[PDB]
Design a protein around this motif. Sequence first.
Motif, PDB file in Angstrom:
ATOM      1  N   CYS D  31       0.830  -1.202   0.000  1.00 27.84           N
ATOM      2  CA  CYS D  31       0.000   0.000   0.000  1.00 27.84           C
ATOM      3  C   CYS D  31       0.865   1.252   0.000  1.00 27.84           C
ATOM      4  CB  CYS D  31      -0.891   0.003   1.233  1.00 27.84           C
ATOM      5  SG  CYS D  31      -2.236  -1.196   1.194  1.00 27.84           S
ATOM      6  N   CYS D  77      -6.933  -3.247   4.083  1.00 25.62           N
ATOM      7  CA  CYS D  77      -6.814  -1.788   4.218  1.00 25.62           C
ATOM      8  C   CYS D  77      -5.828  -1.468   5.340  1.00 25.62           C
ATOM      9  CB  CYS D  77      -8.173  -1.125   4.491  1.00 25.62           C
ATOM     10  SG  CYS D  77      -8.914  -1.543   6.108  1.00 25.62           S
ATOM     11  N   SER D  88      -5.116   3.699   2.749  1.00 23.26           N
ATOM     12  CA  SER D  88      -5.451   3.105   1.462  1.00 23.26           C
ATOM     13  C   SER D  88      -6.122   1.748   1.657  1.00 23.26           C
ATOM     14  CB  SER D  88      -4.226   2.962   0.577  1.00 23.26           C
ATOM     15  OG  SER D  88      -3.356   1.997   1.128  1.00 23.26           O
ATOM     16  N   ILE D  90      -6.877  -2.080  -0.728  1.00 22.67           N
ATOM     17  CA  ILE D  90      -6.672  -2.826  -1.964  1.00 22.67           C
ATOM     18  C   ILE D  90      -7.983  -3.525  -2.279  1.00 22.67           C
ATOM     19  CG2 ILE D  90      -5.417  -4.661  -3.166  1.00 22.67           C
ATOM     20  CD1 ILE D  90      -3.021  -4.101  -1.218  1.00 22.67           C
ATOM     21  N   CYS D 101      -5.049  -0.444  -5.775  1.00 23.45           N
ATOM     22  CA  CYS D 101      -4.897   0.216  -4.488  1.00 23.45           C
ATOM     23  C   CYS D 101      -5.465   1.624  -4.617  1.00 23.45           C
ATOM     24  CB  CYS D 101      -3.416   0.249  -4.083  1.00 23.45           C
ATOM     25  SG  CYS D 101      -3.193   1.032  -2.460  1.00 23.45           S
TER      26      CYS D 101
END
Lengths: 17, 17, 128, 128
Positions: D31, D77, D88, D90, D101
């Motif tokens: 991420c 996350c 962020s 995914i 992402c």
Amino acid sequence: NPFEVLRQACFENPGLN
Amino acid sequence: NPFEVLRQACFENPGLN
Amino acid sequence: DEEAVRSATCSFSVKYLGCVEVFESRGMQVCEEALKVLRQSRPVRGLLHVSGDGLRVVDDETKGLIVDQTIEKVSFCAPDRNHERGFSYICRDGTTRRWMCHGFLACKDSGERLSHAVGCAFAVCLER
Amino acid sequence: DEEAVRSATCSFSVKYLGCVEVFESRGMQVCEEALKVLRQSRPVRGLLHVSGDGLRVVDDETKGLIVDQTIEKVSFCAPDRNHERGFSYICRDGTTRRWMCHGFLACKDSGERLSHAVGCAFAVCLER
């Protein structure tokens, strides 16, 4: 050694489909 | 997708002893 | 720079960030995490001499030798992938039995140039 | 925030940084590398709604729905370990068969708060 530096929430989705 | 971003020297020492 | 390393005329103006223990002897992510710790800790300006005899850092203000690292105990070196002037190396400190990452900011060059010169020092030392 | 996610009253003011393909479905380093790519690319200010029904991002200026993500296709996350307001997740984009992402800067909260709320949405969706 005066130049030495001493050393001092995420989720997976179980319902991923 | 207008929000998508498109994707675009170290050494080991063999004489370590 | 290769001939300069062989001839002991290779030196780079640097800010020396200090060192921090690491638990792997190689790896760019390992070095970058160490650099983050060093940066979160005042850097000392000096000259990094690179030769088959060692990596020597001499402090500009006191002219004293503050790093004197034999090449044989340096395991890995790398530019910082996230900062163009960043550079570090990992070495074995035999007296404390630790791996240590020493961090630098190059004042006048890319971190890649410093790494290539230290890689040359690896080759020269092994040759000799 | 758990009751807010269950009740569909959980929303965070965010800057949406966009999305970028990744090649792993989980991991904080994954991420963070994606966030670096997103940051090196103008973020859109909006509201991130977190519920068992999805992660919805609504643009402040147009009031339009610019992200509408089902929870079932979000794999992971995380807060950004290097920036307190970064966040962020995914997800699987089934139409292109890619992992993507999606990156955020929280305007008023820690990235950890956003991650915990999305983790709650994982639990709620599975419960239901």
